[PDB]
Amino acid sequence: TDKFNYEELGLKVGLEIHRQLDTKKLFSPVPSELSDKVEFTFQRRLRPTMSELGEIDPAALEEFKKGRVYVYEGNYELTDLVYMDEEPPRGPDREALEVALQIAYLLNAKPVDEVYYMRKIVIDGSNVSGFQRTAIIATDGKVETPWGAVGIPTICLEEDAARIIERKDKEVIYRLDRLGIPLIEISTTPDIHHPEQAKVVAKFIGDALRATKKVKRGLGTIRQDLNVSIKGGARIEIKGVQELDMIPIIIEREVERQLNLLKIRDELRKRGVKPKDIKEEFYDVTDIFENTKSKIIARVIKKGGKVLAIKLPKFRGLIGREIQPGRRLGTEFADRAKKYVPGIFHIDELPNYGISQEEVNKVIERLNLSEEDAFVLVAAEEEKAKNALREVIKRAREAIEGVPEETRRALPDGNTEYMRPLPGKARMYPETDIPPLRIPDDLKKKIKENLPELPQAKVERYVKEYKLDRSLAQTLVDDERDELFEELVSMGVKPSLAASILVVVLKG
Amino acid sequence: TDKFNYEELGLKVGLEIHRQLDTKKLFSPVPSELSDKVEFTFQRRLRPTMSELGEIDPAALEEFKKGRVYVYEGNYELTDLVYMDEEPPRGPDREALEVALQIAYLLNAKPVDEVYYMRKIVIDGSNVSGFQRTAIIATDGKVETPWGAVGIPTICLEEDAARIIERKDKEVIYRLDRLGIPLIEISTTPDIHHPEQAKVVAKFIGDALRATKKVKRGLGTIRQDLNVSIKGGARIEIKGVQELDMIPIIIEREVERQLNLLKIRDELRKRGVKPKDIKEEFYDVTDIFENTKSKIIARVIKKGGKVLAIKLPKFRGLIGREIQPGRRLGTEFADRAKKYVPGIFHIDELPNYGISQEEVNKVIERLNLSEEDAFVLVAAEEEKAKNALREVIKRAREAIEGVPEETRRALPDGNTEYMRPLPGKARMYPETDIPPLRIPDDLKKKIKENLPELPQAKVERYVKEYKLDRSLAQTLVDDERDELFEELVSMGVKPSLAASILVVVLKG
Amino acid sequence: RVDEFLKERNINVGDFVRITKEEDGEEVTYEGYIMPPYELSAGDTLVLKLENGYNIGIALEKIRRIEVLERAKVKPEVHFEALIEGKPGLPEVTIIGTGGTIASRIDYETGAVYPAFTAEELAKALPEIFEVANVKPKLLFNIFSEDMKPKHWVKIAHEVAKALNSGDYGVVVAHGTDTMGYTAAALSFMLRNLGKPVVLVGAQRSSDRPSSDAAMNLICSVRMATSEVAEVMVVMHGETGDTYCLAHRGTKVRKMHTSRRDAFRSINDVPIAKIWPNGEIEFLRKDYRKRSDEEVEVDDKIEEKVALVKVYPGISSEIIDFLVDKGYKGIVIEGTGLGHTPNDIIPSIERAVEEGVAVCMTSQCIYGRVNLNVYSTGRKLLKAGVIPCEDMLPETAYVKLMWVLGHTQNLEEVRKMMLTNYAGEITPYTRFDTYLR
Amino acid sequence: RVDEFLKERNINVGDFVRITKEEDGEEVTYEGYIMPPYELSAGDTLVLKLENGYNIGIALEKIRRIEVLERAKVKPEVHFEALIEGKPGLPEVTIIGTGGTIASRIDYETGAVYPAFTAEELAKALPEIFEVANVKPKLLFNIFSEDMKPKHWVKIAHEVAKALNSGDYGVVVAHGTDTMGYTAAALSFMLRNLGKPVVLVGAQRSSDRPSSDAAMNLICSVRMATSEVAEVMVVMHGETGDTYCLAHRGTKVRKMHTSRRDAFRSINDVPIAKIWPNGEIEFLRKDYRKRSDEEVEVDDKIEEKVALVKVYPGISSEIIDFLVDKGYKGIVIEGTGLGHTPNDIIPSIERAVEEGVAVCMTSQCIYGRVNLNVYSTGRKLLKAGVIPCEDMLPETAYVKLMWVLGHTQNLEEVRKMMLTNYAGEITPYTRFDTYLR
Ligand SMILES: N[C@@H](CC(=O)O)C(=O)O
Ligand SMILES: N[C@@H](CC(=O)O)C(=O)O
């Protein structure tokens, strides 16, 4: 039973997963040990690079103008010249590589005959060399599913950036220990057409990585992202999705939000509103609030703050409409607005927050509002309120047109929240220091045969072969004891119940 | 009219003179500049050396036992490895070498044909390498004088030691800037047989030095040490003879000192007292002084000190006998005692300082003294008191023999004061790092002919050739303004009177 | 084997293609633009750039189908204005290009990296310098320092003097990292009677990577060109960080590390001064040549038939003998300790000297001062007529000898020459703060 | 000219004499003991020690009368106890004397200095050691680190292995300073499977000078022979003052200074520990071989037909043609920067590989690691089959290649071995605190 007929809507779900490998650093024989011991620190600046025809990448020029300086922390024993950009890289690390080759087969993907490394430029400063070393390792892999097969176009073995420590102004601090730890990137295809189908592919891959029993089981170590779209909607990047079980719902709260946003755009088109029909003019309604029982605004004024308004033709009864359980088109306004102000007030949410109905109508006047005209108020320091409202403008207009193609972060509720615009296309160029690596069919075969045991498969062998409880079989693996048990039984000992019962039950 | 018939008393005097050359350091192209800027420091320890047959010099060994470390101060610009003992020396510095040669001839000395450098061993720590590089450069020179010619057996060019900053116990701190400054040492012969003759040699040599016009001028830059003696007395090294004009009186006062001591020794011999008659037994008399009116002793006691006596048979009226204007035999006792104690009391000098006849007779009794026997007190902690009374006994003993050999220092009085015991013979050995230096016959001649004119020879010429008044001539020279003066005239200018007068008189 | 196989089937590098290959029986298909073969790795593999921009390798063998979809778009080709209009009041500074690229453009969709040296390109890359002085880039020759030779240190010295005497306020030479300390010492002896600043400068990290040290070094370099310092210096990072650069006197400079920006150190003397891109300067000494009106006089004279020989336990005197027989005029020996050679070799040296060869002694330990009077072996080498080169750098002594011989063959003269301080090479005495610093 | 003349008039060195000579027309009269001639110079001069101790020089021609007062009072020829009565409960450390003197007696009256290696001497001279272990002086041979060949290293290993396995708690080799680092690297590879401390030690300042660093070096070295560190190490002052010594791993030590005590440094890797004559210690690293009972196994095999060639701008390929030509099996090229060579010479190297010669690459920049993939020149040297030696000291790589060529002649095998890490020789990665230290 589904919430929507995902087949009608243009449900397209894509999936991308990053995971640290438990090998040495990808381009230097270094222990992927994190450390909180800072024994020394050094300064650095990064500069944009000219194009084929002398043009400086705007996004980078921007970062440059800011005039920020990058400070890196390292410890004498774990920090080496290679990740200080003081010695050429050496790699890819053989373990990390093989591990990758192994994860690739577990996904029916075809490895490349020869690996060429690339350099993806990085503005942040999170990459001392100014770039992250990446490389395609396998293509066209697949994950069989109930709703059909979902394909894996790419599988890459790249470098993880360093740990941010503090973002002082004009100075960002980073810890090197993390920099260089291998990263495995798996990307699905936006062909996924079902919320549970995603969880399947997502889970499976997850198991395949566990199967290598040479992956990091850390807190902030598993990155999984989703990008959702519907027919007549937009590709939205949902970053930072917590647990595998949240995928199903999150993908739906999106299909829902996008389905409602449109049901609103159709409403606007009907009322006949247009992008240009939303002049960016600010009214100084401040005075009308000189005497308001709204602590919020009142505080602003008393501190030399002004209240400004905006006129949104035919946006009445829609700004306050709920798109996601607990969130309404107005919430979307506040988010974009949050960029300059802590929040906003719109005609459809008040009277409230200590704002007298009087005050409301009194505002409808100075800006002359129709039976469908609405407004937005932002109490802040002169300019703040201007930019804030402008950002509100941008969205408002976009709302008339459709679904803004943006990048949102997931919430505990399952709904999303605005983050930033869809990331720009990355600029890469050959990683000239590392010779091209060839993968012998010789090695391809050796690895393709001895592939590890997917978690579930084990669970299903314990039951079928050792005849034990399904409850015990699961809890035996679901609790990482998958090894201890095998090691115990390996002694021809504790049949399975002796061990299983002991571990899964006794211990607890 | 002299004080004594210095011919009867076999007066023998010698002269030893050290002087720094205003050149670069003797074994490294370094400015002989001094600096109070200490930018870095390093610690060092020196160690004795075995002899051909495994022996260790008692003195140097003794110093090893004291377990003292040598700390050396130096700055980054005036301290080189050579004087840190971290690089072989190069030298001698040609300038200093020649100035040496010049001084040699200027003193009728016969320069050596080839120079070889020695390493005089040094315990102090004043020489970072453990030794002082020295060399003989000229020999058998001579200074003519009213009493006959006096010889100059040796002329040497050696390194001066580091400056002492502090001698903490178990750590002496030295400054390196002075280490390496060239030193020219000129030594007389023990034959000067008259005080005046001494001053004459002393003055001539001083002048030969001024002539070279590249001998350092300043406070601590000149060493004039004497060594007096008398028929039946002892060779006494007298350090720190401040100004040339004291040389005659010092020598005279010394002859007096020694002459008197002998008179005393004779009185003693006549009374019949042998060193063995001075038992080193200390009588405790802290009692007879339990309620004395001597502020001195009284304090010592209240702090828990004692008053030990010493019985000196037949030494009455001899301890108080004057040996030099204002100095008595007891001043010698006290002098030696000063090694452990601030002062001493003796029977000839009291009643006095708060000590009553009662206290005196009470002591004369407990020691059972005759009318010829005497005593000597010391008020201090029991041990210190003993060591002092020991030091006094050694002296009272030496007194019956005659004139103790020692090295005394000069006083503004013209008197001497015990200082330390004569230094032992120095151990020397080949400085194999510096090649022998051959002195070409052409260089000796090219130097021997262009000898500077002595200062007095100038004053005399000014009076003949230039006719200027003597007072003018001398004052120009005696106030080092002789250099400038010569400059004015070179211009065929200010005849002499104008120049002379303007300087010596006008600018004064 | 891929090169020809490719052309046959008519496939141009840069062509968008669709290839299919059999991997383990399976069938795989890619779509990308054909790329150039890795520097040196012949046959068996074809490189393709997927629309991901990612580079892939295809085993020719396994290729079953190659179809050209679109052709090689290859077009535009843009050029930049070599020199540009200076700003009022700023000094003139010429950057002689010796091959050490200080900037580059990079075709991201092609993967190529082009060296840049135009005033326009330098401005588009290093505004900072065009704010300190008016930079006139003059391309002398694009060469790797690795294979740089004396004939070049002559062409440089002249090119420098020309610009220097034309009236430039100072000169900056874009050299390579490897040889730079050799060149530095060459320009130090050849540029006789200098009055303006001459600055060698290069980048340890290529100048196309966002992290490069090219920029800051350039910036500090042009600032030094404007100094009151009249000598050849190397100006490179003083530490790992983008802190300050160090200005080393060009004859006491050595490349101590293999790849750090920290790489160039002043051996046996202090650097001239610390400088910050910022513009601030802190002199570390007072004794450096001041700027003057003096016109510079080159001095090409150099006998390049000189060899540098590092001694090690057990070297057959045959290597010295070969050099002699072959007719070398001078030999600088990278000796041992205070300047020693196995006694096992003294004889061969002794002959080369009698053969009128100039033999100089330096020392395997970069720091410190040679001195052949302390030990017996040294005294032997002295008696054999070996010229002890005080505290001169081995590489500096090599270069100083080619120059000194190009002036004379008289060994008595060669001493004086060698043992005479024309630039910073010999030091009156060794300071304590000069080691490992 | 004086040696004979003296004998002619029937004189013996040491005879107390009275010379009369002329100087600018007039007589000068001396009286001293005839001394030996300057250690390296024909003499037109005679050396005479006066009753001052001061040595003086006289020109023969000026000598008019040279009477003999007393004659050569030649005496004794004292002897000392080779070994001395040990102490209950103290380790047995044998000091293999390789020629580097750790003590000495000096005859002041004669002015001569004799080395000392006798236990009775090391006792009175340097007591400290005998309150730490029973010291057993073992004369292996008197040689100067300058002229020491591989064959000597061998004679060393055995004697160490022997004494070591013969119950000794640890061994201490008293080597000269000039080549110590080469020796150190040697034993390192030779003493296979070591379970006890091996310590090379020497003095920068001669044993006779009160300021010699000989004593403290010995103490510190013995305390280490007594340690829990199971590997070959060099122990010398860490700083310039009498403070603490540093114990470097014998495959990462180089003499970095011509005369200082700081002379020895660890390169590309951190020292093992700090030791004080006093006794305190301070490891600076945790990963060092520990004490064990395993028996040390000496591994002789070494092909010494290998040369070390330091590149430089202007080298002719002839220097390399000559080596291949005279049958050298191995060449350790200590090149430029990341490990480059002038391209005009890559062919003579290309040819040396074809003639099955082992060509290894290291860099003149003592610190850092060689990497030949970055730049084109490097890739070219790779194609020619040159073996990159990571961050291995050029001297170490020399020693190593000899040893390794003493095992194989097959290049594929020489590659693996060279690149295999038997001692600290190579490093997995470069620490930031491993340069100029
Ligand atoms: N191989 C480079 C080395 C560098 O500059 O870092 C060169 O062209 O000299
Ligand atoms: N020439 C000496 C130098 C020294 O050890 O200090 C040697 O035998 O190595």
Helix (H) or strand (E) holding B407: strand B407-410
Are A232 and A344 found together in one domain?
A: no
DSSP B38: -
Are B223 and B329 found together in one domain?
A: no
* Distance from C-alpha of C180 to C-alpha of C331, rounded to nearest angstrom: 21
Binary contact (B135, D103; C-beta < 8 A): no
Q: How far is CA A405 from CA A229, A230, A248, A274, A329, in A?
A: 9, 12, 21, 19, 15
Strand B40-44, strand C358-361: pairing: unpaired
CA dihedral angle for residue B235, residue B236, residue B239, residue B245, rounded to 10 degrees:
-90
Strand B327-328, strand D281-283: pairing: unpaired
* CATH number of domain containing C68: 2.30.30.520
Chain B interface, mutation test: which of D211, D259, D276, most B Cβ atoms within 10 Å?
A: D211
Which neighbouring-strand residues pair with D290? D229
Helix (H) or strand (E) holding B337: helix B329-337
Catalytic residue among C255, C329, C380, C400: C255
| In contact, B215 and B184? CB cutoff 8 Å | yes
| In contact, D422 and D361? CB cutoff 8 Å | no
Are C50 and C82 found together in one domain?
A: no
Whose CA is closest to atom 8 on ligand 2? D144
Catalytic residue among C98, C118, C177, C226: C177
Question: Using CB atoms within 10 A of its CB, is residue C225 exposed (0-12), middle (13-18) or buried (19+)?
Answer: buried
Angle at A429 (CA atoms; ends A90, A433), nearest 5 degrees: 20
Whose CA is closest to atom 4 on ligand 1? C177
| In contact, D143 and D152? CB cutoff 8 Å | yes
Binary contact (D259, B87; C-beta < 8 A): yes
Tokens of residue C342, six digits: 């196995």
Are A305 and A349 found together in one domain?
A: yes
Helix D376-383 / helix D346-354 crossing angle, nearest 10 deg: 20
* Distance from C-alpha of B319 to C-alpha of B332, rounded to nearest angstrom: 9
Tokens of residue C225, six digits: 């060109």
Binary contact (C429, B434; C-beta < 8 A): no
Question: Using CB atoms within 10 A of its CB, is residue C78 exposed (0-12), middle (13-18) or buried (19+)?
Answer: exposed
Q: How far is CA B311 from CA B316, B330, B339, D288, in A?
A: 11, 14, 20, 71
Q: Taking CB atoms and an 8 Å cutoff, what residues of chain B touch D212? A: 47
Domain that holds residue D113: 78-299
Residue C24 known to be catalytic: no
| In contact, A20 and A197? CB cutoff 8 Å | no
Neighbours of A281 (CB within 10 A): 12
Q: Taking CB atoms and an 8 Å cutoff, what residues of chain D touch B134? A: 54
Q: Could you tell me which of C34, C143, C167, C20 has the C-alpha nearest to residue C93? A: C167
Are A488 and A379 found together in one domain?
A: no
Neighbours of A369 (CB within 10 A): 19
**Any idea how long chain C is?**
437
Tokens of residue B240, six digits: 């720190």
* Distance from C-alpha of A458 to C-alpha of A203, rounded to nearest angstrom: 15
CB within 8 A of C432, min separation 6: which ones? B40, B74, B76, B79, B80, B81, B84, B86, D240
* Distance from C-alpha of A175 to C-alpha of A181, rounded to nearest angstrom: 12
Q: Taking CB atoms and an 8 Å cutoff, what residues of chain D touch C179? A: 313, 336
Shortest Cα distance, chain B CAs vs residue C430, angstroms = 5
Tokens of residue D328, six digits: 């050298």
Tokens of residue D162, six digits: 């022997």
* Distance from C-alpha of C137 to C-alpha of D200, rounded to nearest angstrom: 55
**Any idea how long chain B is?**
508
| D179 CA: nearest ligand 2 atom | 9
DSSP B371: S
Residue B5 lies in a domain: no
- Residue of D341, D343, D375, D379 with the most ligand 1 atoms within 8 Å of its CB, for mutation: D375
Classify the phi-psi angles of A113: left when phi > 0, otherwise alpha if psi is within -120 to 50, otherwise beta. Answer: alpha
Q: Could you tell me which of B426, B422, B17 has the C-alpha nearest to residue B226? A: B17
| In contact, A398 and A262? CB cutoff 8 Å | no
Chain C interface, mutation test: which of D39, D364, D391, D431, most C Cβ atoms within 10 Å?
A: D364
Residue D213 known to be catalytic: no
Its sign, for the CA torsion B379, B382, B386, B388, is: negative
Q: Could you tell me which of D108, D262, B158 has the C-alpha nearest to residue C437? A: D262
| C99 CA: nearest ligand 1 atom | 8
* Distance from C-alpha of C190 to C-alpha of C173, rounded to nearest angstrom: 15
* D425 φ, ψ (degrees, to nearest 5): -30, -50
Are C308 and C411 found together in one domain?
A: yes
* B295 φ, ψ (degrees, to nearest 5): -55, -40
* Distance from C-alpha of C190 to C-alpha of C198, rounded to nearest angstrom: 12
Given C36, C59, C77, which residue is the final one in a domain?
Answer: C77
Angle at B139 (CA atoms; ends B136, B141), nearest 5 degrees: 140
Strand C264-266, strand C253-255: pairing: antiparallel
| D177 CA: nearest ligand 2 atom | 5
Strand C92-97, strand C63-70: pairing: unpaired
Number of structural domains in chain C:
3
Q: Is the beta carbon of C337 within 6 A of some atom in ligand 2?
A: yes
Residue A7 lies in a domain: no
| D202 CA: nearest ligand 2 atom | 5
| In contact, B128 and B84? CB cutoff 8 Å | yes
Which neighbouring-strand residues pair with A238? A226, A408
Classify the phi-psi angles of C431: left when phi > 0, otherwise alpha if psi is within -120 to 50, otherwise beta. Answer: beta
Its sign, for the CA torsion C408, C410, C412, C418, is: positive
Given B375, B403, B431, which residue is the final one in a domain?
Answer: B403
Chain breaks in chain A (C to N over 2.5 A) after: none
Binary contact (C257, D334; C-beta < 8 A): no
The position carrying tokens 């080596």 is D323
Helix B455-463 / helix B195-211 crossing angle, nearest 10 deg: 80
Question: According to the 3-state scheme, what is the secondary structure of A208-235?
Answer: HHHHCCCECCCHHHEEEEEEEECCCCCC
Question: According to the 3-state scheme, what is the secondary structure of chain C?
Answer: CHHHHHHHCCCCCCCEEEEEEEECCEEEEEEEEECCCCCCCCCCEEEEEECCCCEEEEEHHHEEEEEEEECCCCCCCCCCCCCCCCCCCCCEEEEEECCCCCCEEEECCCCEEEECCCHHHHHHHCHHHHHCCEEEEEECCCCCHHHCCHHHHHHHHHHHHHHHHHCCCEEEEECCCCCHHHHHHHHHHHCECCCCCEEEECCCCCCCCCCCCHHHHHHHHHHHHCCCECCEEEEEECCCCCCCEEEEECCCEEECECCCHHHEEECCCCCCEEECCCCCEEECCCCCCECCCCCCECCCCCCCCEEEEECCCCCCCHHHHHHHHCCCCEEEEECECCCECCCCCHHHHHHHHHCCCEEEECCCCCECCCCCCCCHHHHHHHHCCCEECCCCCHHHHHHHHHHHHCCCCCHHHHHHHHCCCCCCCCCCCCEHHHCCC
* Distance from C-alpha of D5 to C-alpha of D377, rounded to nearest angstrom: 65
The position carrying tokens 């050490």 is C100
The position carrying tokens 């055995």 is D158
Residue A3 lies in a domain: no
* CATH number of domain containing B487: 1.10.150.380
Binary contact (D260, C369; C-beta < 8 A): no
What resolution in angstroms, rounded to 1 decimal?
3.0
Are B118 and B191 found together in one domain?
A: yes
User: Among residues 115-154 of chain C, which lie with CB inside 8 Å of chain A?
Assistant: 116, 120-121, 124-125
* Distance from C-alpha of D176 to C-alpha of D182, rounded to nearest angstrom: 11
CB within 8 A of A37, min separation 6: which ones? A75
Chain breaks in chain C (C to N over 2.5 A) after: none
| In contact, D163 and D138? CB cutoff 8 Å | yes
Are D270 and D332 found together in one domain?
A: no
Q: How far is the CA of C167 from the centre of ligand 2 (A)?
A: 53
**Any idea how long chain D is?**
437
Given C12, C46, C77, which residue is the final one in a domain?
Answer: C77
Whose CA is closest to atom 9 on ligand 1? C176
Experimental technique used? X-ray
Q: Could you tell me which of A146, A134, A27 has the C-alpha nearest to residue A85? A: A27
Amino acid identity of residue B215, one-letter, is V
Its sign, for the CA torsion A430, A432, A434, A435, is: positive
SS3 A432: coil
Q: At CB < 8 A and 24+ separation, what contacts does B434-437 make?
A: B434/B27, B434/B89, B434/B90, B434/B91, B434/B92, B434/B117, B434/B133, B434/C373, B435/C373, B435/D38, B435/D41, B436/B114, B436/B115, B436/B116, B436/D38, B436/D41, B436/D45, B436/D47, B436/D57, B437/B92, B437/B97, B437/B114, B437/B115
Residue B301 lies in a domain: yes
**Any idea how long chain A is?**
508
Tokens of residue A423, six digits: 């990331």
Domain that holds residue A249: 12-272+404-451
Please name the residue of chain D whose CA is at the shortest distance from the CA of residue A42: D432
Q: How far is CA D380 from the centre of its chain?
A: 37
Peptide bond into B351 cis (omega under 30): yes
Peptide bond into A146 cis (omega under 30): no
* Distance from C-alpha of C32 to C-alpha of C110, rounded to nearest angstrom: 12
Are C257 and C325 found together in one domain?
A: no
Query: Does C110 reach chain A within 8 Å, measured CB to CB?
Result: yes
Are B362 and B423 found together in one domain?
A: no
Shortest Cα distance, chain C CAs vs residue B177, angstroms = 13
Quote the radius of gyration of chain D (alpha carbons, Å).
Answer: 26
* Distance from C-alpha of D87 to C-alpha of D90, rounded to nearest angstrom: 6
Number of structural domains in chain B:
3
Are A425 and A322 found together in one domain?
A: no
Residue B217 lies in a domain: yes
Of B116, B121, B435, the CB nearest to D47: B116
Tokens of residue D24, six digits: 């600018």
| In contact, C315 and C307? CB cutoff 8 Å | no
Q: How far is the CA of D100 from the centre of ligand 2 (A)?
A: 7
* Distance from C-alpha of D263 to C-alpha of D269, rounded to nearest angstrom: 16
Amino acid identity of residue B355, one-letter, is I
Which residues does A contribute to its contact with D (CB < 8 Å)? 28-30, 40, 74, 76-77, 79-82, 84, 86-88, 90, 432-435
| C145 CA: nearest ligand 1 atom | 9
Are D14 and D91 found together in one domain?
A: no
* CATH number of domain containing A333: 3.30.1360.30
Given D19, D44, D77, which residue is the final one in a domain?
Answer: D77
* D436 φ, ψ (degrees, to nearest 5): 55, 35
* Distance from C-alpha of A462 to C-alpha of A495, rounded to nearest angstrom: 11
Q: How far is the CA of C179 from the centre of ligand 1 (A)?
A: 8
Are C183 and C121 found together in one domain?
A: yes
What is the DSSP code string of A5-56?
A: -TTTTT-EEEEEEEEEBSSB-TTSS-B--------EEEEE-----EETTS--
Tokens of residue D115, six digits: 């080395």
Residue C178 known to be catalytic: yes
- Residue of C141, C147, C178 with the most ligand 1 atoms within 8 Å of its CB, for mutation: C178
User: Among residues 395-434 of chain C, which lie with CB inside 8 Å of chain B?
Assistant: 428-433
Are B409 and B350 found together in one domain?
A: no
Are C292 and C355 found together in one domain?
A: no
Tokens of residue A102, six digits: 């192994």
* Distance from C-alpha of D361 to C-alpha of D388, rounded to nearest angstrom: 5
Question: Using CB atoms within 10 A of its CB, is residue D50 exposed (0-12), middle (13-18) or buried (19+)?
Answer: middle
Ligand minimally distant from the alpha carbon of residue C200: 1
Are A445 and A507 found together in one domain?
A: no
Question: According to the 3-state scheme, what is the secondary structure of A120-160?
Answer: EECCCCCCCCCEEEEEEEEEEEEECCCCCCEEEEEEEEEEC
What is the DSSP code string of B174-200?
A: EEGGGTT-EEEEEE--TTB-SHHHHHH
Are A425 and A391 found together in one domain?
A: no
Catalytic residue among D255, D329, D380, D400: D255
Please name the residue of chain D whose CA is at the shortest distance from the CA of residue C320: D319
Are B227 and B312 found together in one domain?
A: no
Are C192 and C267 found together in one domain?
A: yes
Q: Is the beta carbon of C145 within 6 A of some atom in ligand 1?
A: yes
* Distance from C-alpha of A53 to C-alpha of C78, rounded to nearest angstrom: 6
Are D93 and D241 found together in one domain?
A: yes
* CATH number of domain containing C383: 3.40.50.40
Q: How far is the CA of D364 from the centre of ligand 1 (A)?
A: 14
Binary contact (C429, B30; C-beta < 8 A): yes
Interchain contact A/B (3 or more Cβ pairs less than 8 Å): no
Which residues does B contribute to its contact with C (CB < 8 Å)? 28-30, 40, 74, 76-77, 79-82, 84, 86-88, 90, 432-435
Q: How far is CA A140 from CA C28, C63, C310, in A?
A: 8, 17, 57
SS3 B415: coil
Query: Does C436 reach chain B within 8 Å, measured CB to CB?
Result: no
Are C262 and C304 found together in one domain?
A: no
Are C83 and C72 found together in one domain?
A: no
Q: How far is CA B428 from the centre of its chain?
A: 21
SS3 B18: strand
Q: Is the beta carbon of D178 within 6 A of some atom in ligand 2?
A: yes
The position carrying tokens 């000229």 is B138
Q: How far is the CA of B354 from the centre of ligand 2 (A)?
A: 71
Q: Is the beta carbon of C347 within 6 A of some atom in ligand 2?
A: no
Q: Taking CB atoms and an 8 Å cutoff, what residues of chain D touch C265? A: 436
CB within 8 A of B138, min separation 6: which ones? B100, B101, B104, B105, B107, B109, B110, B111, B112, B154, B155
Q: Taking CB atoms and an 8 Å cutoff, what residues of chain D touch A435? A: 373
* Distance from C-alpha of D206 to C-alpha of B433, rounded to nearest angstrom: 11
What is the DSSP code string of B74-107?
A: E-TTT-BGGGTTSS------HHHHHHHHHHHHHT
Helix D394-405 / helix D180-190 crossing angle, nearest 10 deg: 40
* Distance from C-alpha of A33 to C-alpha of A36, rounded to nearest angstrom: 10
SS3 A477: helix
Residue D240 known to be catalytic: no
Tokens of residue B364, six digits: 């004369």
Are B326 and B417 found together in one domain?
A: no
Q: Is the beta carbon of C177 within 6 A of some atom in ligand 1?
A: yes
Q: Is the beta carbon of C377 within 6 A of some atom in ligand 1?
A: no
| In contact, D186 and D300? CB cutoff 8 Å | no
Are D225 and D324 found together in one domain?
A: no
CB within 8 A of A177, min separation 6: which ones? A33, A34, A35, A74, A75, A78, A79, A162, A163
